[PDB]
Write an enzyme that holds these catalytic residues in place. Structure first.
Site, PDB file in Angstrom:
ATOM      1  N   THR A 103       0.816  -1.205   0.000  1.00 41.64           N
ATOM      2  CA  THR A 103       0.000   0.000   0.000  1.00 41.64           C
ATOM      3  C   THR A 103       0.853   1.260   0.000  1.00 41.64           C
ATOM      4  O   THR A 103       0.382   2.313  -0.443  1.00 41.64           O
ATOM      5  CB  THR A 103      -0.935   0.006   1.211  1.00 41.64           C
ATOM      6  OG1 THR A 103      -0.163   0.140   2.412  1.00 41.64           O
ATOM      7  CG2 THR A 103      -1.755  -1.279   1.272  1.00 41.64           C
ATOM      8  N   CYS A 104       2.095   1.176   0.489  1.00 38.75           N
ATOM      9  CA  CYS A 104       2.968   2.342   0.506  1.00 38.75           C
ATOM     10  C   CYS A 104       3.410   2.743  -0.896  1.00 38.75           C
ATOM     11  O   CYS A 104       3.770   3.904  -1.112  1.00 38.75           O
ATOM     12  CB  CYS A 104       4.182   2.053   1.388  1.00 38.75           C
ATOM     13  SG  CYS A 104       5.367   0.896   0.663  1.00 38.75           S
ATOM     14  N   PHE A 105       3.383   1.810  -1.845  1.00 37.78           N
ATOM     15  CA  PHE A 105       3.545   2.101  -3.263  1.00 37.78           C
ATOM     16  C   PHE A 105       2.214   2.110  -3.994  1.00 37.78           C
ATOM     17  O   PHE A 105       2.191   2.308  -5.213  1.00 37.78           O
ATOM     18  CB  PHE A 105       4.489   1.095  -3.932  1.00 37.78           C
ATOM     19  CG  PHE A 105       5.836   0.990  -3.278  1.00 37.78           C
ATOM     20  CD1 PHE A 105       6.654   2.102  -3.176  1.00 37.78           C
ATOM     21  CD2 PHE A 105       6.288  -0.217  -2.777  1.00 37.78           C
ATOM     22  CE1 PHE A 105       7.896   2.012  -2.584  1.00 37.78           C
ATOM     23  CE2 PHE A 105       7.529  -0.312  -2.179  1.00 37.78           C
ATOM     24  CZ  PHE A 105       8.334   0.804  -2.083  1.00 37.78           C
TER      25      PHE A 105
END
Lengths: 127, 446
Positions: A103-105
């Site tokens: 989710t961070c990308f």
């Protein structure tokens, strides 16, 4: 009494189901090894259009890590390293494992599932 | 002996004559007061029951029974009641008997014209007799009566046929009868349970036949919306589904029936309705599903059912206004993956309102400064009780004009939900990765 909800559904209860402009998401999607006219991608978009608002929101949480819709639209979708568009990656591992999210990308890894029904089943089982 | 049997017979003749004006509640209170004398009561009741059995010139009473037919209620030639008038004589006699249950005559009657627990057996036999068995009203009244009195094998068979054949209030009084009889004797309990099971098995066998026609006709419909005529005998208010469910609810009320040929074909039928791309089309089997979850999920197979039909049981619950935790489908409260979010939201909100239904909720003021709302609210509320918090808060900003309280409260919630994430309070901080989320600030000890 709250433990009947999922970890998604408590968020959807507190902040509500967003209205997702799938046209805005599609307009702000990046395809890396799939293409926008791949058959599995047409199945993906057909599935996501066929999902009700709660499964759509659960998908958005799965791939972005939140149900929050950006006010400016998904063009302004943030990731770990600045504005990051949504993104679909072909998962070249075996197609008997679920899609996976980073989710961070805002990153989706998606196996090349052989059919609409199986892709829909696996995505719904993931969310 | 305040009154004789000729004066009682003159009073009882009033039950036959159907006059709207006549105050028959006053006549019932006269008979009730007279029936405090036990011998009078006994003669009165034995006469009223002889009137019921005989339902199944001074005495020239012409009742309009049908079109162009004005019958004489009495045929005297040994006194008989003309079967067209009979259902009204029955209705007035059961109206009187219901009050006497809250609390020779023929020969006397011709002599004029020429000038609790024991008779329960007769009133249960009465269910077999045609003028009663026809009339849903007389059946409902007789069942109310039996439900009052209750406070053998054929008589229970005739009581159960009232459920296996065609009155929701009358059949709930029949449920009361069958319970209160079963409270009497372990042997009547057992015989009524086994004869309920016998009827439920008959209903299940013919329900499997009907659903087998439904499934076959859905096969023939697809293999080339749903208005299959085989559906009519399931939609029907008097359908075997409603009889089967009624009987099972009585069985389960007496508990304090092997039909896998039904359950697996209910299975494939539901699966073939869901694959047939219509949704309310399932609901013609909703009561059979509710029977399934009654017979199963005893206070497993129902869990595999709720898995293989998950979206179907969700269609059921979403359509049903039956409150999830008061209906039969309450067991799955704890197996929560098998429900939709908004179904769970309704269950949540109904159970919350049920738990706090005893609390009277008031309106409650909150006086805050537009520039201090967060700390003024903390001061006002943080010592308030949970039940005072559950009152509906209306917010007053000092000196501001009146405005819609709902919009002003929504604004208030919005400003607060912002100020939660003002760093000056150090309550929540954004995830260094996401930068749009918020988690507890580990630096709030300042």
């Amino acid at each position: 009494l709250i433990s009947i909800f999922t970890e998604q559904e408590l968020e959807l209860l507190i902040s509500g189901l967003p209205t997702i402009d799938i046209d805005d998401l599609k307009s702000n999607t990046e395809y890396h090894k799939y293409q926008s006219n791949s058959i599995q991608i047409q199945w993906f978009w057909r599935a996501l259009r066929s999902f009700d608002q709660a499964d759509r929101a659960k998908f958005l949480q799965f791939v972005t890590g939140t149900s929050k819709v950006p006010l400016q639209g998904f063009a302004a979708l943030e990731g770990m390293n600045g504005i990051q568009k949504f993104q679909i990656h072909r998962d070249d591992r075996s197609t008997d494992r679920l899609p996976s999210a980073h989710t961070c990308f805002n990153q989706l890894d998606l196996p090349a599932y052989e059919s609409f029904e199986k892709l829909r089943h696996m995505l719904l089982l993931a969310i | 002996l305040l009154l004789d049997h000729e004066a009682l017979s003159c009073l009882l003749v009033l039950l036959f004559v159907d006059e709207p004006k006549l105050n028959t509640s006053r006549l019932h209170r006269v008979l009730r007061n007279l029936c405090y004398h036990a011998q009078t009561r006994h003669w009165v009741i034995r006469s009223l029951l002889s009137i019921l059995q005989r339902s199944s010139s001074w005495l020239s009473v012409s009742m309009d029974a049908a079109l162009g037919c004005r019958t004489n209620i009495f045929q005297i030639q040994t006194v008989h009641i003309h079967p067209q008038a009979a259902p009204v004589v029955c209705r007035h006699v059961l109206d009187t008997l219901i009050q006497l249950a809250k609390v020779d005559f023929w020969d006397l009657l011709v002599k004029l014209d020429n000038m609790e627990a024991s008779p329960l057996g007769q009133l249960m036999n009465m269910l077999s007799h045609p003028v009663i068995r026809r009339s849903s009203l007389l059946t409902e009244k007789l069942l109310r009566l039996l439900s009052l009195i209750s406070i053998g094998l054929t008589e229970n068979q005739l009581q159960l046929s009232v459920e296996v054949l065609t009155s929701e209030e009358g059949l709930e009084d029949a449920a009361n009868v069958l319970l209160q009889l079963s409270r009497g004797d372990s042997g009547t309990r057992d015989t009524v349970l086994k004869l309920l099971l016998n009827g439920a098995r008959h209903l299940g066998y013919t329900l499997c036949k009907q659903i087998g026609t439904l499934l076959a006709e859905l096969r023939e419909y697809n293999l080339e919306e749903l208005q299959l005529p085989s559906m009519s005998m399931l939609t029907s208010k008097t359908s075997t589904q409603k009889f089967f469910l009624r009987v099972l609810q009585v069985i389960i009320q007496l508990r304090d029936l092997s039909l896998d040929e039904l359950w697996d074909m209910l299975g494939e039928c539901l699966k073939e309705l869901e694959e047939s791309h219509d949704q309310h089309a399932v609901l013609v089997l909703q009561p059979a599903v509710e029977a399934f979850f009654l017979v199963h999920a005893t206070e497993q197979k129902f869990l595999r059912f709720a898995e293989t039909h998950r979206t179907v049981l969700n269609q059921i619950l979403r359509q049903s206004t039956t409150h999830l935790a008061d209906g039969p489908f309450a067991v799955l409260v704890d197996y929560i993956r098998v429900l939709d979010f908004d179904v769970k939201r309704k269950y949540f909100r109904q159970e919350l309102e049920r738990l706090d239904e005893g609390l009277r909720k008031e309106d409650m003021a909150v006086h805050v400064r537009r520039d201090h709302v967060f700390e003024d609210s903390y001061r006002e509320l943080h010592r308030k009780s949970p039940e005072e918090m559950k009152n509906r808060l209306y917010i007053v900003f000092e000196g501001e004009e009146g405005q819609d309280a709902g919009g002003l409260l929504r604004e208030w919630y919005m400003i607060i939900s912002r100020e939660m994430f003002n760093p000056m309070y150090a309550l929540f901080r954004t995830s260094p990765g996401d930068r749009v989320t918020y988690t507890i600030n580990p630096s709030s000890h300042c």
